[PDB]
């Protein structure tokens, strides 16, 4: 058997759940997993296609095998943690800065 | 764009996404492929910083 070469039609003993949006939860479409926020996308695909890449050769949007809609994938891993302190001699207070 | 093309390569394996290799190979047996991906990315980081 092959892996990630054709739309799902066999699979196994795995029941399907519901669809949640605006959340950075895990997803699985035709065996391909990942992590990202499922939002709306104005771009449309093709009837004889399924997956979709981009300039960075990454999975940005995958067609749902039930609703047949377009949902863009946006990972929430975007940001940093910083802290600015005036020194331990002046005062013992800091300020958390978000990147 | 050079570092973007390196992430999609296999570096002697069969896939590039870490969530795809672990879903098909167990960690006790996939250790021979994860080490090649980490080492194959450290060469691009040392070349980019140079």
């Amino acid at each position: 058997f092959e892996l990630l070469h054709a739309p799902a039609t066999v699979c196994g003993p795995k029941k399907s759940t519901n669809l949640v949006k605006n959340k950075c939860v895990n997803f699985n479409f035709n065996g391909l997993t990942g992590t990202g926020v499922l939002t709306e996308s104005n771009k449309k695909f093709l009837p004889f296609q399924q997956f979709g890449r981009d300039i960075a050769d990454t999975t940005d949007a995958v067609r749902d095998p039930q609703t047949l809609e377009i949902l863009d994938i946006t990972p929430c891993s975007f940001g940093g943690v910083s802290v600015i302190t005036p020194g331990t001699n002046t005062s013992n207070q800091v300020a958390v800065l978000y990147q | 764009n050079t570092l973007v093309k390196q992430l999609s390569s296999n570096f002697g394996a069969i896939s590039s996404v870490l969530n795809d290799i672990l879903s098909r190979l167990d960690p006790p047996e996939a250790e021979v492929q994860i080490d090649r991906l980490i080492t194959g990315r450290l060469q691009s980081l040392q070349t980019y910083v140079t």
Partner: peptide, 24 residues
């Protein structure tokens, strides 16, 4: 609108990645 001269404004018109670890 900006505090620049006509020469500085003329040369100004001529002159996804962070998800992979390429922050700017």
């Amino acid at each position: 609108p900006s505090k620049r001269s006509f020469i500085e404004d003329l040369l100004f018109n001529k002159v996804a990645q962070k998800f992979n670890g390429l922050t700017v």
